[PDB]
Write a protein that binds this ligand. Structure first.
Ligand SMILES: Nc1ncnc2c1ncn2[C@@H]1O[C@H](COP(=O)(O)OP(=O)(O)O)[C@@H](O)[C@H]1O
Ligand SMILES: Nc1ncnc2c1ncn2[C@@H]1O[C@H](COP(=O)(O)OP(=O)(O)O)[C@@H](O)[C@H]1O
Ligand SMILES: Nc1ncnc2c1ncn2[C@@H]1O[C@H](COP(=O)(O)OP(=O)(O)O)[C@@H](O)[C@H]1O
Ligand code: ALF
Ligand code: ALF
Ligand code: ALF
Ligand SMILES: [Mg+2]
Ligand SMILES: [Mg+2]
Ligand SMILES: [Mg+2]
Ligand SMILES: [Zn+2]
Ligand SMILES: [Zn+2]
Ligand SMILES: [Zn+2]
Ligand SMILES: [Zn+2]
Lengths: 334, 343, 367, 29, 367, 367
């Protein structure tokens, strides 16, 4: 949780509202992963819970600040999924709702933070509606998500929505160059893969994900001339399958764009691979493979407990089957 | 640790007893018969008490230790029986057993009944200590191949004339359930004093009580017996097993077959089996399957399996058994309309 | 008045019970030869005679004359057991009392000698509902039973019982009563009751019984009520039609033979009875899938679908597979598009019409 | 085959062709 | 003001609409004296299960005796009507489904009835009972005391164990017909002195499916909206359903490929401010009705008489393929409506799509 | 303290509620005529005032003056209900009280007389979230409760409720507020609050509300917070990301002429400018619909598009209607699945590629 500079302007607005007392009791922040919305929410909560703040900065020495640093403030309830799980249950939401009834122990404001609104189940989202609609006095909520359209309409309508705009591409590239040392094409490719969100590309570079991407690219380069896509299984069967499927979809889309003729592509560091992919496949086949890859990624991310190995094996077998002549390709439908 | 089988325990009991006895296995009938024989021999030799305990988290080990240490007024050489849990002893239970065997006495005769211990469970301090002065009887349910011999031996022991057709019918109906088969033999003997059993006589007093496991279904599919596979599937459905277990058991074998078929174009089968460490007893069977199924097949099967998995785990449908039956018929050499595949 | 037809005609002698020949013969031989086990367990379907046979065995196990398979029925013990108020016969409904305390008390009661009988028999009914601790106590009591104590167990789901309890008792499994025996029993009962009847009505009642004599007697009583003191073909047929709940198979059979008016009549009949349309559609899909699999292999049809075995087998034999595949595909499309139809009933009718007198045009890969 | 048929297929509209005219019982042209 | 449903609960077998078979069976059973000890009632909601159960209970305990025509004036009948009779133990199984409640209920069934000749237990919502509760009742149902009768009512009998179903006589109630509902509503309104029109009653009966309680609730809502009277316009506004004439005219315009007329009628409808989803549903229903008329002449009821002839004209001129194409096009349009930029835009685009692919008069192509 | 506009402007009387005229008229007629029902179910979309209507009805029922359709709003009962501390009004959050135990406890307190009010009102919010057992437990009491208790149900998913509950309630459907009504309410609220505004901003907010007043108020509050305390047209346009310029026309023209490079360059420039993709798709769909409608009749073009009329006309002359339908359907599909794509830009590019195939540091306190 680092404070990126580009978050400074938006913060300056939000806190100002809370300085005038005309602050909404339910703020929903929309931002891509790695943008730093969590840092903004933490700063806002820290300012709210400070007993005697000056300007836009918490004092850092009052009881509230000391407890926040210790992380044992009686207020500041936090909702997050269990360590072993990946969803937020109704029990935690109901417990927080029950606890909110009583007065504030420190006599200040009560802050509730939801780690990620998209992880809430249907029951939890429905339960939180009444609490969000008419919260007690001096109660503040903070929700974070990357796609508000996924949330329930009833839940969305009860929150004031604030959107964070990613910075300019040139500024992000310069910041990444100052941070990490890599080729310009690699930086551009990482930034575009992260939907132009600096911080996510930095995280991608920090881990071994770049080596996995290179291995996947080499495997695809070997596989495309041969027509044996099954070999890609070893490069895709992993806990981070959605990211690799996203990379494959990006490669296919870049190949299709090159086939149609374009100047801007996502994969800037591998012109040879995209050119070879475009040469060896028809645009219709590329479209079909892209659609299947996206559908499989969505199914993998949505369904819980689904076995990834079987799904990926079936996907690869279907991809190999499509390339045969005289086969009905799929068509999107409602 | 003297290892033995139920068919030869009697002689050992005639030779002499020992400090402890281990009855590890899965079949209930063999375990019960061995326990009864051991108890009868001990009673004949001068053992009176028959203390028994079922191992559970609520069980009190202090009472067991007190019984092992205390002495009766007008009795001596008490016997102790333990019923282990199906999963087996854990670390705490291992330490408790270590203490118990530390308190073991010559007069006390210990008997333990339960499922066979795994590689980790079987390796324990108490087990190692007991191995020096213990006799273990392995009671494993006979497979289909060996069942007719066991049935014939049991029938001969009971002074009954059993025909080949009757033996086959009894094996088919009560496969995997030795207790039911023994009770059926007793009922048939009671019905006919003459003891002459023919096919109609056994047929008129036999029902279906077979017990199977997913591995049997997978093996039946691999061999290619449609009727046996369907019967096993129906019996498993009536039992009430979870389809997910069947799907996961079949997934590994199906993926292995697909990989071998893909890699069998330019490699001998023996090399692939050695690379994959395929068990010897299965090798030939596997090869047979790999020869019966074409490459176009094993792709429709994977698609149907994935569709069934998605239906079960997303829509919560109740038509999983019908799809399993269809896939079972598909694995066997059958046309299949391909409409049900939804390819 | 007249008691209840089922309750009145409970068998009181081994010669009255119909069917179950093997169990009766085995019990009679065991009693005659003195080979009596320490525990019996009767299993089977509902209304086959488990409790009746258990009571008959108890009556014949304590008769004044002696241990015999043909109890006199006239001595004090037989009469009292018939009246259900015998001192030694301790009958316990395990379903009503499952807690450990009740079973503990009942099993502790065994320590006393019988009052006026050679054996003290315990008749536990619905044993599968006992608690785990109750099972433990029963096993502890049953490992070394006294010589004068016998246990009779009646159950319908024996798989619920633990293996340890099963291994200690001899299990007798009863079979279905079959159509002919049920028909003969109904004929005998009606002749004894002086009630007019017709052979076809009795045949229909036996067919609807589905291997359960109690159900047959209940349906006979209901028909007598509907028939105004008599059984007639028309009254029984109307009663069954009112109780008929197999509209899916009838709809499939009517559709496969290209009949429109019959399909409309069946749809109206189904609408008359509260039924979920999607449930009917999925049932039809399942029936078509089963027919296709039976066509692929005759062993697909299991024992569960015994009631409609003949009609499904005939449909599989006669209908070509291509028609079955087409019907399955069109009904699948209908199920897919059902939620967006103007009405559930209208959507189902439209899908039935499409499957009846239409043929979809497949995309046919043109390139 | 025909452009209209291809467009209808793309739109997801399924076109149904009569198979048993005798099944219908009524004045139909 | 007591609601109509509670006020007009039947109090005699002559006040029940339909259900002829069950009433006849019960009357014959009570007259002949062949009375069972376990009755089960099944059917869809609001068809008179509890009503007939209470009527039967009143008939059993009437002071005059056991008759199929209870007086309705003696003390027992009056108390049962007021729902405070001591011998009619009414149990809400949905509220009390735990096993201990069943044990407590069964522990005190031996005692004789306080004042009546029978002690009738009437359990409602039986399907909510737990499995242990179901098992605990088996012995009592099989052999209850001579002065105890069990009456059971449920909506989904398939949820009960087969064992219970074999112990009790089953009666299935059918959904009431439209004409019966209309007649009952007319009689009730006449008794209540409320103005009404035939069209309003027809619409209410159509919208009530088959449950009379729904019809009564809709009638009460219409009376409330109509300010003390039932009027066709008030019912139409309440149901929010446009008259069939506008939809029929729009469908006819679409069939003949008259774009200007269709657009003008759509603009007029928009001026009227009707709901677009209702319009699409009505058009789909009209197309389905036309298709069913093509299937068989009798598929059309008298409810469409006002336009019947004109509708019949469309049956003998449009080929079935065109009807299917229009139905599928409208269904697809309704499927994709939610994502359209506007409801009006969605409907207009759907109509334009239908016109463009018109089999006979497609829109001209460019050159 | 300060409260958001959504909760501060909650209506307090029947004269402060916009639209829903039929529901208010029905309630007033029922209260005046004295025909009071014991089960009201308000159903409809979200942000239309179901809870407000229920609260107003409860306030009217328990007013000191009497049962009136126009609550005074000044007596002790009205202000107590407004403050939410009224004893006899039990507001139950069904989304957090789904367990059967809570419902059973609730139904055991229905037999007590009200504390101070003349009725005991139970207002269940979001009743669709209760479990099946809760519904079954409610059924019995809800069918015929005491005379001093009234049930009020509010939900947005009436399909979840079982038919049994729906058959015994008065259902009131709330319509979605029109754009004009929302704009009128917004301008009234802003004038009362002394906030500067312009007609175009209010029109845009009303259009974006999608028929929900709560959404309109939330958007207005967001604009005020980000608009420096002023609702300016420029600020609202920037917040909503309206296209304004003719970017959609250029994109659709490029797509129609099948020039991949042009459309890709336009998409890249738009992404660099940072626009909303949903707005772009909606604008393109609207342009396609207008082109099709103009192709129907040349005069169908509106007067607001004159500045870009001529170009559009050329499309109507060069593109067959079937191609227009295909493009509209493809864009609609792309809009439907836009959220599920890995990136919004990727989804837009995929949809356009599909369409192209158609052709002949100051850190405050954070680590
Ligand atoms: N074999 C039979 N012969 C005659 N009647 C029978 C027979 N089996 C069951 N019944 C009838 O069923 C009733 C007894 O039910 P029973 O079969 O003992 O219950 P269960 O077998 O489910 O324990 C009696 O009313 C009896 O008339
Ligand atoms: N056969 C019938 N005759 C007259 N009214 C009926 C009939 N069936 C149902 N009703 C009406 O339906 C309402 C509710 O019936 P109810 O007792 O709830 O039946 P159920 O128990 O099947 O729901 C009553 O107000 C009653 O007037
Ligand atoms: N008809 C209406 N007139 C005025 N304001 C309304 C109306 N409907 C809803 N609102 C506004 O919406 C807010 C929340 O409404 P709510 O009670 O949640 O309705 P629902 O229960 O249908 O969501 C209220 O504070 C109110 O200001
Ligand atoms: F009497 Al039963 F199962 F119905 F034992
Ligand atoms: F009371 Al009901 F069906 F609603 F019997
Ligand atoms: F409070 Al609502 F729909 F009733 F948001
Ligand atoms: Mg019985
Ligand atoms: Mg009822
Ligand atoms: Mg609300
Ligand atoms: Zn501070
Ligand atoms: Zn006797
Ligand atoms: Zn009377
Ligand atoms: Zn007031």
């Amino acid at each position: 949780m680092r404070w990126y500079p580009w978050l400074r302007p938006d913060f300056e607005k939000l806190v100002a509202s809370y300085q005038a007392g005309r602050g909404h009791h339910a703020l929903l922040i929309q931002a891509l992963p790695g943008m730093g919305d969590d840092a903004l929410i933490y700063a806002l909560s820290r300012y709210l819970l400070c007993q005697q703040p000056q300007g836009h900065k918490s004092c850092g020495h009052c009881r509230g600040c000391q407890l926040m640093q210790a992380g044992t403030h009686p207020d500041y309830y936090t909702l997050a999924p269990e360590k072993g799980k990946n969803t937020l249950g109704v029990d935690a939401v109901r417990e927080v709702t029950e606890k909110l009834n009583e007065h504030a122990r420190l006599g200040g404001a009560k802050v509730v933070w939801v780690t990620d609104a998209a992880l809430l189940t249907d029951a939890a989202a429905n339960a939180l509606l009444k609490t969000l609609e008419e919260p007690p006095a001096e109660t503040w909520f903070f929700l974070a998500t990357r796609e508000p359209e996924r949330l329930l309409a009833t839940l969305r309508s009860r929150c004031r929505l604030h959107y964070l705009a990613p910075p300019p591409e040139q500024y992000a590239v310069t910041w990444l160059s100052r941070e990490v040392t890599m080729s310009q094409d690699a930086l551009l490719a990482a930034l575009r893969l992260s939907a132009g969100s600096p911080g996510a590309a930095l995280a991608l570079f920090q881990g071994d994900n770049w080596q996995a991407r290179e291995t996947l690219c080499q495997a695809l380069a070997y596989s495309v001339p041969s027509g044996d896509w099954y070999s890609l299984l070893a490069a895709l069967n992993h806990e981070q399958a959605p990211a690799r499927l996203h990379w494959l979809a990006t490669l296919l889309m870049d190949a299709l764009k090159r086939h149609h003729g374009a100047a801007q592509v996502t994969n800037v560091d591998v012109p040879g691979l995209v050119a070879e992919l475009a040469n060896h496949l028809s645009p219709s086949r590329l479209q079909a493979i892209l659609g299947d890859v996206c559908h499989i990624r969505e199914q993998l991310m949505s369904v819980t407990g689904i076995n990834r190995e079987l799904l990926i094996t079936d996907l690869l077998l279907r991809i190999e089957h499509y390339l045969q002549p005289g086969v009905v390709l799929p068509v999107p439908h409602l | 640790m003297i290892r033995l089988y139920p068919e030869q325990l009697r002689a050992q009991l005639n030779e002499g007893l020992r400090a402890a006895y281990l009855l590890l296995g899965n079949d209930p009938l063999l375990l019960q018969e061995s326990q009864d024989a051991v108890r009868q021999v001990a009673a004949a030799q001068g053992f009176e008490e028959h203390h028994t305990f079922s191992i559970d988290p609520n069980t009190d080990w202090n009472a067991i230790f007190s019984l092992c240490q205390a002495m009766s007024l007008f009795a001596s050489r008490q016997t102790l029986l333990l019923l282990l849990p199906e999963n087996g002893p854990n670390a705490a239970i291992n330490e408790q057993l270590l203490t118990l065997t530390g308190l073991l006495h010559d007069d006390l005769l210990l008997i333990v009944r339960g499922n066979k211990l795994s590689k980790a469970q079987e390796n324990a301090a108490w087990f190692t200590a007991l191995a020096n002065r213990s006799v273990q009887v392995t009671c494993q349910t006979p497979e289909q191949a060996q069942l007719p011999r066991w049935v014939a031996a049991r029938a001969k022991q009971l002074n009954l004339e059993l025909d080949d057709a009757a033996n086959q019918v009894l094996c088919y109906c009560y496969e995997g359930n030795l207790l039911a088969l023994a009770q059926a033999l007793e009922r048939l003997s009671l019905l006919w004093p003459d003891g002459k059993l023919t096919l109609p006589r056994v047929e008129q007093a036999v029902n279906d009580a077979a017990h199977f496991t997913p591995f049997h279904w997978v093996d039946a599919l691999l061999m290619g017996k449609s009727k046996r596979a369907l019967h096993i599937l129906q019996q498993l459905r009536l039992e009430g097993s979870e389809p997910v277990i069947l799907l996961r058991t079949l997934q590994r074998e199906l993926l292995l077959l697909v990989n071998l078929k893909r890699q069998s174009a330019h490699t001998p089968l023996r090399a692939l089996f050695d690379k994959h460490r395929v068990w010897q007893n299965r090798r030939g069977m596997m090869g047979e399957a790999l020869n019966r199924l074409s490459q176009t097949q094993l792709r429709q099967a994977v698609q149907l399996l994935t569709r069934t998995e998605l239906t079960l785990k997303q829509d919560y449908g109740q038509s999983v058994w019908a799809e399993l039956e269809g896939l079972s018929l598909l694995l066997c050499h059958k046309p299949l309309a391909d409409v049900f595949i939804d390819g | 008045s007249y008691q209840v037809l089922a309750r009145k005609w409970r068998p009181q002698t081994f010669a009255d019970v119909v069917g179950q020949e093997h169990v009766l013969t085995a019990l009679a031989n065991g009693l005659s030869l003195g080979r009596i086990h320490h525990a019996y367990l009767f299993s089977g379907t509902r209304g086959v005679g488990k409790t009746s046979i258990a009571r008959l065995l108890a009556k014949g196990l304590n008769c004044e004359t002696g241990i015999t398979a043909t109890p006199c029925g006239v001595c004090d013990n037989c009469r009292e057991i018939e009246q259900g108020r015998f001192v030694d016969l301790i009958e316990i409904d395990a379903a009503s009392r499952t807690k450990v305390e009740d079973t503990r008390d009942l099993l502790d009661n065994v320590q006393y000698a019988p009052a006026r009988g050679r054996f003290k028999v315990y008749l536990i009914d619905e044993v599968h509902m006992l608690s785990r601790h109750s099972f433990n106590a029963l096993l502890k009591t049953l490992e070394e039973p006294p010589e004068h104590v016998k246990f009779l167990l009646a159950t319908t789901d024996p798989q619920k019982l633990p293996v340890t309890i099963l291994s200690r008792c001899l299990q007798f499994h009863l079979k279905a009563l079959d159509v002919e025996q049920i028909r003969h029993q109904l004929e005998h009962i009606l002749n004894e009751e002086h009630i007019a009847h017709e052979p076809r009505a009795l045949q229909l009642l036996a067919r609807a019984a589905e291997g359960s004599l109690r159900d047959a007697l209940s349906l006979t009583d209901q028909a007598i009520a509907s028939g105004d003191g008599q059984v007639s073909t028309q009254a029984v047929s109307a009663m069954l039609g009112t109780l008929d709940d197999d509209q899916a198979l009838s709809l499939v059979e009517a559709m496969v033979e290209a009949n429109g008016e019959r399909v409309m009549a069946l749809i109206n009949e189904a609408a008359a009875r509260g039924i979920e349309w999607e449930a009917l559609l999925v049932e039809m899909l399942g029936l078509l899938h089963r027919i296709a699999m039976v066509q692929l292999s005759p062993a697909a049809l299991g024992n569960d679908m015994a009631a409609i075995e003949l009609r499904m087998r005939e449909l599989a034999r006669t209908i070509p597979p291509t028609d079955i595949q087409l019907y399955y595909q069109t009904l699948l499309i209908g199920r897919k598009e059902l939620p967006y139809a103007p009405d559930r009933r209208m959507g189902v009718e439209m899908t039935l019409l499409r499957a009846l007198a239409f043929h979809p045009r497949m995309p046919l890969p043109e390139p | 085959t025909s452009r209209r048929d291809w467009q209808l297929q793309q739109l997801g509209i399924t076109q149904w062709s009569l198979r048993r005219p005798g099944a219908l019982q009524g004045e139909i042209a």
